Design a protein around this nucleic acid. Structure first.
Ligand SMILES: [Zn+2]
Ligand SMILES: [Zn+2]
Lengths: 178, 647, 616, 178
RNA sequence: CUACAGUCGCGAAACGUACGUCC
RNA sequence: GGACGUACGUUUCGCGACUGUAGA
């Protein structure tokens, strides 16, 4: 929005969405319903509240914006396509992300168990520089405050993954303009 | 060690000397309230007069918990605290414990048995009576059998120093009332059966009650059943073959019962099996050798249909693999016991479809949808907060082991540890301590009273998983029945105390009139000598002239010809009930019958084969008619009392 | 004009002179076998003796059909065929028709009225009674009221020339029996009430009956109801709002009908409406001016909740667009019937959410799924071959008119004629739309599936019980039914007032008349001859005028108030004048001395001064 | 199966799938069940017993094999993608197909009921040559008998359609190898 | 006005299965 | 062995409401 725009916003796909969500026709707004829906049974179903993308990345030019407001507890980060769907995001071999846990602590995971302070970013943006493995969570307005860095071994597709609390109906996440 | 403000408002009418139905929603709050009434009652007495406060406990863990508290508190004041249980009722005189103690915590079942014998002939020796969990005093309870002796002394005209009937409960309850007019009629009927005038509730100290209330939120999640049910199609073909095989020896099998069209794997089919099986036990073929063959074959054809119908309810709620392990467990036990022509045909008919049943059970697309979202709600809370304890309530004990093996061997639930209560992340119990902030009601329909510890609440959930609209709408009206309970209590609390003692005085006289009208004695005993036959083999076991009655509850056999008719077998869990010691278990001593006839116990010095009427058929030797009795009191015959001078 | 061998097998025990239970599942075979028994009974009579064979027809189209065939058959033999219907027996002597004719097809309801008046004092004048559809002779039927005089004459000691009680039918029936030993008792109770011993059935010529049997195959199609009920949420919000503004008139409203927590859109809600409607009619205030406003307001509140719940059942079964048509017809009817402060509140709130209900109705996303598989099975059978004309069985008269807006009101279905599809509510591809060569059965719950499944079990146990009775002896068959007829005869053989009450309306509570002016015409009709009642009512023409043998339904009556328009009764012409025959159901009886009110639904449950009518 | 193979086996899509079919993971077998399937309500749903494919056409090389046995009545043919969804196969203005009707007559439509004899092709094979408009149904082993001629105006997306009797349970089709 | 049939609901009574408690 | 309580389900009896059909 303020710096040099380097990438375009991703879009949700219906081939990795679980049987509990009802993402609409704009493909950037997931929502939880009261009753789950019967979908196909394949190896791409997460059986969780996780959503993956299909936007193919590039050499070094990556940036996307995702709003996690109007959410009780969320988790947004980077995950690989060559991963088991039954596993939890942030517990696999190499998937670093930031999760807002139930104990009101904004924790962060890296392949460790380190925690941040008591902050609460509303509009969190993720800067990615895969040419040298640079990650920085410049969310909003705090003189480009990152406060966390992850090192990734970029040799695989790394579509951004998302997670929200699926046991609370009415919760929704929205992707907005960078 | 220190009382509070809300622990003194409840015991304030109790110290005045009147009966109270104090309802505290805490676990240790009811223990501290009762200690305040017990300490105040003994101090107000002058010299020479002493108190005899009795604390009734309904269960043995409740009896042993309150025995340590009442002994570690009334020890500096010089009071004697004792306890009489079922393992302690023998080897001691019952009259000498009450006259030499004050703080007896004996169970109410011993007091009902003593009132019929003659020891402690009246309740005037006691000065205070505390009924823990007094909401069970509805009909024929051991709490109610003491009140029948109490109300007969008050309204009889021989009233002496009657004691107080205070009771510390946690939920007064409404029952099966629909409106507030019937809900009000239940509380005054409970107050009449307990002789109450005051109902204490925390009204001025609601702030301190909010800290410990254990009030969770409702999280109803209705799911759907499976569409592609291929496990049911293979089982129902075996049930139609066994039903047709049993019709080759009984053409009127459909006429023996009045149930409608039955679906396999339901509760309506299970009632049809018992009604059919009880109808083939009264066959009267005069050959008396072919009769023992048709009745033995129809008993085995109805027992396999009972296990086939029970295995489909397991596949409806639990996993498909654990339903196959229930049939293979039943067929392994029936092979080791005995083998004949009837059981071998049914065994080899199941083995021909065993490989077909084992292939559809190991399919990843045949997962139960009730278990498919139970794993989803168990992996979302543990990702949110990974230090939570949960609890799971199961209705049937045959499903509490199927969901234990489901977690042990699941990659998505590798963090849970089994806590089967038929270092523990889950607790798989059947029927209920204030430490697990998650409640899951897996098809389990008064709500769960998880009020045991004086800790905190911290936020809990009440997920209800079911696959039918009956269990969804039952909890919706249970919140309405619980809402109208507090309204009917507050309406009763704004009355006058002088008219409420007269309002319940007409209910105690009306309920005694029904109790004095239902005094129909026993009929004339049949002096004819009938014989008892087996239920599976229909072999002659004994006659009704060798049956002796021990203590008006148990029936033994006196003659020596019966002693070679059974074979012994050791009990898996022996125990003792006040006159006996369970040592063995008697069975039918035929070739391949192996029917459970009763039990073998030691009464004083001898060993008596105490039998039950649920495994015999009474055939009269004069006419030839056969009848099926289910209880020993319904079998009216010449009941000769036991005499140890003979043998 | 060609009787086959299987038609002659059924008539073999009938010609012997005994009462039979001949049953045939076809239509053409059942009328042709009765002609052979009627021809054989009259030809076998000697000279000087004449037959009086009667044919008890139940309905009027059955009476009209059996009158043309019996006249065209017995015309060369020289027989006197006639017919006595309800629109025929007025001012005609019954004794003259039965003495001048022999092939009388008179209605059995006229014979019950004749047996009480004195004419035809015994049933011995007849010789061959033919009961059409004799399976209705169970309890209190007009067929069962003739047999109460037949069994009284036979068991009375003076049994003379009794006629034959041969009865034609199409199905013996089982009833409410579950086992074979219980289904056996129903059949022998039917032959005991009909005084017969032989049940004639086909046992040698089954190959003729299989050619014409009209027996398709069943096909169960059970589906789940809709879940996204956007129409229900706006309606139930309007009903919960209307119920909240009705609690300000009557404080103790919720404790009147205490059955359970009611749900909208079900039949349990409809029982809650009529119970609370009757509770607001027994109110007694001593001002008599505010009471007339309270019961008028609570009547319009309970009736609007009745019309809202009535349209809710149509939305779950029929299309959503017909549910709004049922509500717009009710509101436009009261728009020209009267206007006060009470109806103006409910009409203005309905027009507020009228565009909200119109928006959701036109979208095909919120559509009932019971019409979806009905549309699926219609375009699948006609795609194979255009020779699959259908018959639809509809129970509710409001539900069959809702389907007429779906045949030509939907662009997918166009090869139908609302002919090509029948909408007969009461009778190769038959569809059972909530009614309980191939058949179908559409439903939304498992109750209709299990109800039809035990009907096929009832047909299996009926045919087994028939052949069990056909191997008994004739001596024990007449002996078994003798113990049944003596048992029912014992049960069959086993106070006015002098006060002065007044009659008040149910919704207006106005003084209409007293009980001293109510007269009795023919023990069923109650009218008022007083002059004060003549100004308390207003007339209104009848939409469908008819008569029943003594009257003329010329006009309906209504309450003469400002906006009441209550259905009080009807206006008839009995002999030479007019009398306002009213009904006790839409009235309230109040005592002058006691003052308490009572609600009665039938005239026989209201014991009062029953003064007979006087022409002077 | 003995000549030069020109095309590959088709695959059913989940965007034009009927609400009564329960096609498995191999996407080449239509099967009708007792209960319908809850799907979305859009303009792509046939609301009939039909199904479409995902293979776009080419110049001249079209051939596939489908098995029409174990079925009471079937109908296999070729239809256009630009087709109204409320219509049934065989009534469109350009749809060459063959219907095995209930009268045991292998009928065919050309938009004009072209009634034929009482032949019963077990496993049918459809030849298509869109370059010159050549259609001939050599089913199995009948010395390449054509038995029908059709001319198409192929200037549109021409995804193949299918049809099966949905009122009889157990009815199923299977696509086999050529 | 009489009569039949179907659905739903309010009560009473009896029985079966399952679970839990105590002697 | 026995006694008691709770929950689900079933078999009846009796009463009431509404809808539909038929007849006078
Ligand atoms: Zn035995
Ligand atoms: Zn009026």
């Amino acid at each position: 929005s303020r710096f040099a725009q380097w990438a375009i916003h991703p879009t949700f796909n219906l081939k990795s969405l679980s049987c509990s969500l009802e993402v609409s026709k704009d493909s950037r707004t997931v929502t939880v319903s009261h009753r789950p829906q019967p979908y196909r049974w394949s190896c791409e179903r997460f059986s969780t509240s996780q959503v993956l993308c299909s936007q193919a990345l590039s050499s070094g030019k990556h940036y996307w914006e995702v709003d996690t407001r109007n959410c009780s507890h969320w988790a947004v980060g980077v995950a690989s396509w060559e991963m088991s769907r039954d596993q939890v995001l942030g517990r696999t071999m190499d998937s670093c992300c930031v999760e807002w846990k139930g104990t009101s602590q904004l924790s962060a995971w890296h392949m460790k168990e380190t925690v941040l302070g008591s902050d609460r970013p509303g509009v969190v943006g993720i800067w990615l520089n895969l040419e040298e493995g640079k990650l920085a969570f410049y969310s909003v307005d705090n003189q480009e405050k990152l406060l966390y860095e992850c090192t990734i071994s970029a040799s695989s597709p790394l579509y951004p993954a998302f997670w929200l609390y699926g046991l609370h109906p009415g919760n929704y996440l929205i992707i907005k303009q960078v | 060690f220190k009382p509070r403000n809300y622990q003194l408002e409840l015991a304030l009418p109790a110290m005045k000397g009147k009966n109270t139905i104090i309802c505290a929603p805490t676990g240790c709050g009811k223990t501290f309230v009762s200690l305040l009434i017990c300490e105040h009652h003994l101090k107000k007495f002058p010299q020479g007069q002493k108190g005899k406060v009795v604390f009734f406990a309904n269960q043995i863990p409740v009896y042993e918990q309150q025995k340590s508290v009442f002994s570690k508190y009334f020890e500096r004041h010089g009071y004697r605290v004792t306890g009489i249980s079922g393992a302690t009722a023998e080897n001691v005189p019952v009259e000498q414990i009450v006259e030499n103690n004050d703080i007896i915590i004996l169970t109410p079942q011993i007091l009902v048995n003593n009132l019929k014998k003659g020891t402690i002939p009246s309740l005037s020796i006691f000065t205070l009576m505390i009924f823990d969990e007094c909401h069970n005093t509805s009909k024929q309870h051991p709490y109610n059998m003491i009140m029948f002796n109490y109300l007969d002394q008050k309204l009889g005209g021989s009233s002496g120093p009657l004691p107080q009937v205070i009771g510390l409960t946690a939920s007064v309850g409404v029952g099966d009332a629909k409106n507030t007019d019937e809900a009000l009629d239940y509380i005054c009927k409970l107050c009449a059966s307990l002789d109450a005038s005051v109902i204490a509730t925390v009204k001025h100290n609601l702030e301190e009650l909010e800290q410990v209330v254990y009030k969770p939120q409702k999280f109803f999640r209705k799911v759907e059943s499976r569409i592609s049910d291929k496990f049911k199609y293979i089982i129902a073909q075996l049930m139609r073959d066994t039903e047709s095989l049993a019709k080759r020896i009984c053409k009127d099998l459909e006429n023996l019962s009045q149930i409608q069209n039955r679906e396999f794997g339901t509760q309506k089919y299970e009632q049809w099996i018992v009604t059919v099986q009880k109808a083939c036990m009264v066959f009267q073929m005069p050959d008396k050798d072919e009769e023992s063959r048709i009745c033995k074959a129809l008993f085995l054809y109805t027992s396999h249909l009972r296990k086939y119908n029970d295995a489909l309810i397991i596949s409806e709620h639990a996993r498909m693999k654990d339903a196959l392990d229930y049939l293979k467990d039943f067929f392994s036990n029936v092979r080791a016991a005995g083998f004949d022509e009837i059981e071998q045909d049914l065994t080899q008919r199941f083995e021909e479809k065993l490989q077909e049943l084992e292939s559809v059970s190991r399919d990843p697309s045949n997962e139960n949808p009730k278990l498919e979202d139970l794993c989803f709600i168990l992996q979302e809370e543990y990702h949110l907060n990974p230090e939570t304890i949960t609890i799971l309530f199961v209705k049937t004990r045959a499903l509490v082991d199927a969901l234990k093996n489901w977690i042990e061997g699941n990659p998505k639930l590798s963090f849970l540890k089994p806590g089967i209560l038929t270092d523990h992340n889950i607790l798989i119990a059947t029927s209920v301590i204030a430490q697990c902030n998650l409640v899951i009601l897996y098809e389990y329909v008064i709500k769960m009273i998880q009020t045991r510890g004086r800790g905190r609440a911290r936020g809990s959930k009440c997920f209800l998983l079911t696959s039918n609209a009956g269990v969804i709408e039952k909890e919706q009206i249970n919140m309405y029945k619980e809402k109208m309970m507090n309204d009917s209590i507050l309406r009763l609390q704004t009355w006058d105390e002088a008219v409420f003692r007269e309002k319940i005085l007409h209910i105690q006289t009306h309920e005694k009139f029904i109790r004095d009208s239902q005094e129909k004695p026993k009929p004339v005993p049949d002096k004819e000598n009938k014989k008892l036959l087996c239920r599976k083999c229909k072999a002659l076991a004994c006659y009704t002239a060798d049956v002796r009655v021990i203590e008006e509850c148990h029936y033994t056999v006196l003659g020596d010809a019966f002693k070679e008719c059974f074979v012994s077998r050791p009990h898996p869990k022996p125990k003792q009930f006040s006159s006996f010691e369970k040592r063995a278990k008697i069975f039918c001593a035929r070739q391949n019958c192996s029917h459970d006839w009763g039990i073998h116990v030691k009464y004083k010095t001898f060993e008596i084969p105490v039998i039950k009427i649920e495994s015999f058929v009474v055939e009269d030797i004069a006419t030839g008619v056969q009848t099926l009795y289910s209880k020993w009191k319904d079998f009216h015959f010449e009941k000769i009392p036991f005499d140890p001078a003979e043998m």
